[PDB]
Amino acid sequence: MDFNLSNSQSDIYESAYRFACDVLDQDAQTRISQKILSTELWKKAAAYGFAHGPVSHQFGGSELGALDTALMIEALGKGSRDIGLSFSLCAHLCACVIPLYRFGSSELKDKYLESLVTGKLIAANAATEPDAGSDIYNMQATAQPCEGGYILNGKKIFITNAPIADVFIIYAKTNPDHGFLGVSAFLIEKGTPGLNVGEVIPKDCLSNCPWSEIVFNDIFIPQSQRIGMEGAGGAIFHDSMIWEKGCLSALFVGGLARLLETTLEYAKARQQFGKAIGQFQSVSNRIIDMKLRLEQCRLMLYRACWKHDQGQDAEADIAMSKLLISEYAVQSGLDAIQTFGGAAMDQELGLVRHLLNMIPSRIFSGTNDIQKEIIARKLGLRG
Amino acid sequence: MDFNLSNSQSDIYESAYRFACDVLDQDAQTRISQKILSTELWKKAAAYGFAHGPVSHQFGGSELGALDTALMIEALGKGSRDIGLSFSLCAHLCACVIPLYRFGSSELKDKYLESLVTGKLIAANAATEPDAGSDIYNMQATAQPCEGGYILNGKKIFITNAPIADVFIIYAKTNPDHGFLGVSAFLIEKGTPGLNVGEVIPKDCLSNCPWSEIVFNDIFIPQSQRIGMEGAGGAIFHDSMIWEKGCLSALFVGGLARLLETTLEYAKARQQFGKAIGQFQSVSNRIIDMKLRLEQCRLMLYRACWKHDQGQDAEADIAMSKLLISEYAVQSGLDAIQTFGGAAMDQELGLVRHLLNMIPSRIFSGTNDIQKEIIARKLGLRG
Amino acid sequence: MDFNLSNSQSDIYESAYRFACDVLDQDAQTRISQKILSTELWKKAAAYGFAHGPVSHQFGGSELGALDTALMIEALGKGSRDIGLSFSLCAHLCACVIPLYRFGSSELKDKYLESLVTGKLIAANAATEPDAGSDIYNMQATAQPCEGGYILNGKKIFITNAPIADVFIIYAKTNPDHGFLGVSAFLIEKGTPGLNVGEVIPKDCLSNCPWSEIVFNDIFIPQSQRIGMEGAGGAIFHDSMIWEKGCLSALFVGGLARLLETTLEYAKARQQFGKAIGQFQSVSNRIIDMKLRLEQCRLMLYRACWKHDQGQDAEADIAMSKLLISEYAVQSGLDAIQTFGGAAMDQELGLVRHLLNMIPSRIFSGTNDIQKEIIARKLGLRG
Amino acid sequence: MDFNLSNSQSDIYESAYRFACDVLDQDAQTRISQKILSTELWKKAAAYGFAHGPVSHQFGGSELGALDTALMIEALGKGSRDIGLSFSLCAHLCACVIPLYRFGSSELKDKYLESLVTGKLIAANAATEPDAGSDIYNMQATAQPCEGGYILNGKKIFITNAPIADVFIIYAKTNPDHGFLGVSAFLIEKGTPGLNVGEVIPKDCLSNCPWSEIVFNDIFIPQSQRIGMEGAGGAIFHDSMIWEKGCLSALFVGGLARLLETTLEYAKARQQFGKAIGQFQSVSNRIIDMKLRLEQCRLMLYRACWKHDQGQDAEADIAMSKLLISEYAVQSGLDAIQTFGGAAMDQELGLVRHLLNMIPSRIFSGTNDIQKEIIARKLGLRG
Numbered sequence A, B, C, D: 001m002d003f004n005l006s007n008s009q010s011d012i013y014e015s016a017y018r019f020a021c022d023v024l025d026q027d028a029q030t031r032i033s034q035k036i037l038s039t040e041l042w043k044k045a046a047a048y049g050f051a052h053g054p055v056s057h058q059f060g061g062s063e064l065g066a067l068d069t070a071l072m073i074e075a076l077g078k079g080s081r082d083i084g085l086s087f088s089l090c091a092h093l094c095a096c097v098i099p100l101y102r103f104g105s106s107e108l109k110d111k112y113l114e115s116l117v118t119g120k121l122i123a124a125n126a127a128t129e130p131d132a133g134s135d136i137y138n139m140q141a142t143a144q145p146c147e148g149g150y151i152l153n154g155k156k157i158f159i160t161n162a163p164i165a166d167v168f169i170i171y172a173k174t175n176p177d178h179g180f181l182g183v184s185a186f187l188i189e190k191g192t193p194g195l196n197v198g199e200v201i202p203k204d205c206l207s208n209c210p211w212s213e214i215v216f217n218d219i220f221i222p223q224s225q226r227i228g229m230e231g232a233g234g235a236i237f238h239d240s241m242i243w244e245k246g247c248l249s250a251l252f253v254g255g256l257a258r259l260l261e262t263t264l265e266y267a268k269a270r271q272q273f274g275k276a277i278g279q280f281q282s283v284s285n286r287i288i289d290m291k292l293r294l295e296q297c298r299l300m301l302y303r304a305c306w307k308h309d310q311g312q313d314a315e316a317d318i319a320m321s322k323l324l325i326s327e328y329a330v331q332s333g334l335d336a337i338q339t340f341g342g343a344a345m346d347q348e349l350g351l352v353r354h355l356l357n358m359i360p361s362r363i364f365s366g367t368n369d370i371q372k373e374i375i376a377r378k379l380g381l382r383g
């Protein structure tokens, strides 16, 4: 048992933190105010290494493990206020780069993977539908096999990066049943006939991270664009969620570390009744809760990633981490606001915007109720 | 013991609800989107009766008790999405109209009170300072007595309605000590030399309800503009907070009643896994919490107002109501968002904006930690 | 709307409180220490009126409504430390006296009801089985119709008062289906051939309130011992639970009122660090929670009972009250213990025994998860 | 970073677990029922190694680090139902053996330490007084220096093991001020003139772990019985609490691991409504909370002990662990009871007794409010 980072891991974290502070956080307030996702800045961050993860050197990646990748993303979360951009970049990595690397043919990787790893192409992951969110195997988009490939029809919604993506990793039914083997994955390029990408739909949470719906009207998918085997898509989707749920969630751990530091500084500096407000137990009790949450969920995250790196079954640990991080991030957001009082209603300081940005952490990649269904199944309660 | 409204009270509630739906809620989405406070619409609502409260018929009021006034404001909260406007109107009523009615001289009431009651003049309440929020008796603005009145200097912050107000109810020190008798209240008109009203400072919560800072640079206050006796201001401020804390908080009870209805409708209609999502206990358990909260805090509010109407000491009951309503409003906001999942990130439906609008309820008129200090004192724990 | 008791209700409460303090609470510590249920003392309390409730004067009752009955039981809970005895007496009233009064034939009432009302006979309610607790319609005891009545077989468990009861109100299947109409109710006397009443089974919660299992080995039930019509038993059981869940739960409201007074007195008197421990916000924040809980659940209880008295549908209100009272009673038990620190480990003061006595409130008459299923159904979430 | 135990640590844990199951847990139910602390069995466990900890081989110890010692005690907590005995043995180790080893003179260690390490003498730690619990530096017992040593007077309360102890580690004032340097520690033998050990005072929590008060009436303490330097006692007390708070708290982590296994087995086996009760989300959501708590507080405990072993400052980490473990142990106790329903009221299964045994974990060695004061001070909020 050892609770230190390796020297390599300390360097990865500190380098990522410096990049997030010195490059991404510069001029963040203007981009946030204007709801701008700068794709030039996104591509710099991708190329710096935030789009690399476990990808091999052959395709321009860094062969990072899960703990290394989570540490990099934790630094990003602590160092940059522009969490919309960071969420966009990490969704591309965890839900698009990594599945293509893990399941795509040599031909598909040779054509697209280095471009996705190095900041040349942006990808979006398209699985959720109007009638298939938590119940993702109810998806109704169909990739009907035909001569030469598939005919694709359907509608996908809530698709992060769709308005800016060059390629789409799309999940659709290649068989009528709701089984583990009815879903397949495909890579489709922007501009393919019949791919209709909707306009950006604004939101108040992660408000500069673009999403939209996409509609497939009789798209022809060439056989060679299928990712993995026929029917693998349920398993490919599942695997990609595991990566997203652990590593991507590290963003909110780093965000909580930044929030706690900001909150402690204010509670020491702001005086009422002749003393720092942190001297009143109502105030310090909440801040202590924020610190307890941060230490607990960080350790759970690190252990989940470490278990994956060891080749152990980490499915329940990752679901537990996802759940704790997101619940703790939202509640600590509210606790920080309450520490600042009326001063929390300053848009520049951004405490309310920070809370808005944490609200979706309990929803993306599977809600926290679905995390508990996963844990319940692993505990043997769904027999 | 009786838990029915009177017929008079049912009529007051239903008339207020119809006005909020048929007048104020029309075109609310455009005003919300554009961050517009329509003063023409505000004045219609004031004149309809939302600026009347307990004021006598002599000054154009309706002689409502606290329970009647709270019921009217509950209807406003349920019926209109434009809670920024409603908060603006109720702050004018509870913190400006009512103290002037209760403490001002016949001369001051004759000059200003009917105008404030009937939608002709807008008022702002100015007590909080940079170094005096919870510790309001630390306020440093000084009204130094002189020949003919007072010389006023100081700075007030977080002042609801200041950018649109015609008159300001201002609290300042007329004596150096932090005692119950060091503070006095004054009415000052917009345009008085030395009154410098700051520009609107935007916020994400209650985002169309304007606030700003105001600065006093050697304002001369004529003696006849003092509200109540010299030193009454601590007691006048306290009394106005009691009215604000009970009646004004009813807005968030009505808002919770609307939110619960919206949430129940969705949980019955949205299906996943072959059934309505309300059939899963994770989902229904949260909605039941929202319903438990609504019923409990509504009863506590009604009893607090009823006690006031009976002439009983309601101070602790009002602090308890303020605390429960605001905590429950925020947590139910988060519960509704979690019920809708990704669909909660629709700006038109407004579930995230609703949460933003509830966040300040735990802060205005005294934070919830200060409510617990008040209750602790009434329980004998501050002896 | 009115939050005062009537003069009649104030007298009922104060008379019950005096009886609980001056008769039942005397020598309670010895009976508690020795795990004694004094049936002589029980019968005095029954005859005083705690076994009367809504029963008509014809059978020696007081024709109390639900709110009156709940107030009497609240006083009992506040005034007597011997909550095991009080629970025993209220179970007899709410689950045995009242169903017999509401559903039994003139012949059955004439034979047994005045004796049960006036402290002459003790009754036990026997519905729960090893395979039928929350799922009460799965009960497997069978009352097979035959010439002259029924042949009864089965086993009932968790039966309050069975070791001391003279008569048993028993629920059993008269038809094979799990429907609303498969269950019937019967009154059976102690000593009937084939009625095998088990020995008292000790417990640490409500430890002097006796319970045991009972077994039916081919009991012959005469036709005239059926309570209500054939198949009414599901509805009779349901109705009796409504009475038990509202009125009987008042015991724990009165117990919380006593606990809060004890806790406030200690927090004012116990000094550390040069002041009363109630002056520290960690301490006063918990006590304030106890007070918030007490006021909220008392109002919910009173409204539920008042709605019943008005002839309105009170089913959801009663389930909400049951849930709030019991959750609040347990958590306030823990909060009081934490206020006293090591001093809470005094058996005479009884703070730990009080917590033990509250633990079963979340279980009897339907667990709190079943209360939420009931509320969910009334909210339309079980369609 | 590594989350595996070493092979040595796995052996320590498994050996301790086997001893707790195969020796201490045998016949535990009889001892629990009879409120028996078997000193013969206690001494076997001490000699097995539970009284060794970090003590050197010179005095018969095992030179364990904090993580090793915490693992041994975690196994004890999981393997033996007789947590009263385990608490007694661990209090002797952490608050008496370890301070004597760390601070006592060669002469005092040579005379007493091997006997305490090996199961020959039992010790009690006596610091708390009627007016000095959380405010331990208010203690009023005085050790007035005189020719040859000290004259001791005072009263100590809540003293674990006092009715069975052969020696007492006693803290008293050697100087009038409440400073870090006013308190000294002394070892006093049973039977010393003027040492009046009270009779066992029963309690419902940890009910077979004996405690009592002790009174000093003009005891003469020889100079050579002082432990450490004059005035070290504040620092010796503090150090002993650090050991007690981390390692001793591991008992409740192991107890939670056992409780969760018992609870999962029941939730899989008990059926209602045609399925295992674990299939209902109200039920599985609570069990998942128990599992989340166990994993989080175990990791926090291990890291606190590891930090100590690394020579790092672990004071805040230990206070956080103490707080989380004890809060989680109590709440999981209530969650297990609610999972079992009426079946939790079985004394043999012991779910209610388990809860009683966890209640004091939030109080011993400093309440959880004092843990938050410690963390607040380490966070810089008490400047």
Ligand SMILES: Cc1cc2nc3c(=O)[nH]c(=O)nc-3n(C[C@H](O)[C@H](O)[C@H](O)COP(=O)(O)OP(=O)(O)OC[C@H]3O[C@@H](n4cnc5c(N)ncnc54)[C@H](O)[C@@H]3O)c2cc1C
Binding pocket: A091, A124, A125, A126, A127, A128, A129, A132, A133, A134, A135, A157, A158, A159, A160, A161, A206, A360, A363, A364, A365, A366, A367, A368, A369, A370, A373, B270, B272, B273, B277, B280, B281, B282, B283, B338, B339, B340, B341, B342, B343, B345
């Ligand atoms: C910021 C963000 C980015 C996203 N990016 C993408 C993307 O890039 N690609 C993509 O394909 N999708 C994306 N999604 C969609 C996300 O996958 C869905 O929002 C998620 O699967 C939940 O589905 P839903 O929103 O339809 O909620 P629903 O499934 O309708 O859930 C509604 C409520 O019902 C509860 N519920 C549903 N089923 C159960 C059950 N069995 N048991 C208990 N409770 C249940 C839910 O927990 C929730 O409380 C994104 C979502 C967000 C918030």
Ligand SMILES: Cc1cc2nc3c(=O)[nH]c(=O)nc-3n(C[C@H](O)[C@H](O)[C@H](O)COP(=O)(O)OP(=O)(O)OC[C@H]3O[C@@H](n4cnc5c(N)ncnc54)[C@H](O)[C@@H]3O)c2cc1C
Binding pocket: A270, A272, A273, A277, A280, A281, A282, A283, A338, A339, A340, A341, A342, A343, A345, B091, B124, B125, B126, B127, B128, B129, B132, B133, B134, B135, B157, B158, B159, B160, B161, B206, B360, B363, B364, B365, B366, B367, B368, B369, B370, B373
């Ligand atoms: C929507 C809104 C509208 C407002 N409108 C007006 C207006 O119209 N006129 C006007 O004069 N003011 C107005 N205010 C200001 C409001 O009165 C102050 O925000 C409030 O008094 C709290 O003061 P503060 O913001 O400086 O917080 P602070 O007092 O700095 O509180 C910061 C934190 O310290 C805690 N704290 C402070 N003292 C204690 C203590 N003794 N014990 C425990 N905790 C403590 C607080 O609870 C809070 O968590 C408005 C505020 C809001 C949010």
Ligand SMILES: Cc1cc2nc3c(=O)[nH]c(=O)nc-3n(C[C@H](O)[C@H](O)[C@H](O)COP(=O)(O)OP(=O)(O)OC[C@H]3O[C@@H](n4cnc5c(N)ncnc54)[C@H](O)[C@@H]3O)c2cc1C
Binding pocket: C091, C124, C125, C126, C127, C128, C129, C132, C133, C134, C135, C157, C158, C159, C160, C161, C206, C360, C363, C364, C365, C366, C367, C368, C369, C370, C373, D270, D272, D273, D277, D280, D281, D282, D283, D338, D339, D340, D341, D342, D343, D345
């Ligand atoms: C003090 C006390 C006195 C009692 N007196 C009597 C008496 O006099 N007469 C009599 O007949 N009975 C009596 N009972 C029994 C009581 O009725 C049962 O304990 C109660 O019905 C719960 O059943 P159970 O204990 O078998 O729990 P179970 O039904 O086994 O419940 C176990 C767990 O599963 C949960 N669960 C079960 N079904 C669901 C579901 N659909 N959804 C979500 N969660 C679920 C439960 O909430 C609980 O958490 C008494 C019980 C107590 C504690």
Ligand SMILES: Cc1cc2nc3c(=O)[nH]c(=O)nc-3n(C[C@H](O)[C@H](O)[C@H](O)COP(=O)(O)OP(=O)(O)OC[C@H]3O[C@@H](n4cnc5c(N)ncnc54)[C@H](O)[C@@H]3O)c2cc1C
Binding pocket: C270, C272, C273, C277, C280, C281, C282, C283, C338, C339, C340, C341, C342, C343, C345, D091, D124, D125, D126, D127, D128, D129, D132, D133, D134, D135, D157, D158, D159, D160, D161, D206, D360, D363, D364, D365, D366, D367, D368, D369, D370, D373
């Ligand atoms: C099982 C058990 C075994 C024990 N064994 C020993 C032993 O062997 N030797 C020995 O010397 N002692 C022993 N103790 C005593 C223990 O040290 C004291 O119980 C503990 O120090 C708390 O003191 P107290 O009980 O007087 O509570 P108090 O100090 O009176 O606390 C009462 C309440 O006030 C709160 N409070 C007090 N001060 C503050 C503050 N500044 N800020 C916020 N809240 C505050 C407390 O948190 C608590 O909620 C034992 C206690 C227990 C439960």
Ligand SMILES: [Cl-]
Binding pocket: A279, A280, A281, A282, C279, C280, C281, C282
């Ligand atoms: Cl405090």
Ligand SMILES: [Cl-]
Binding pocket: B279, B280, B281, B282, D279, D280, D281, D282
């Ligand atoms: Cl469910």
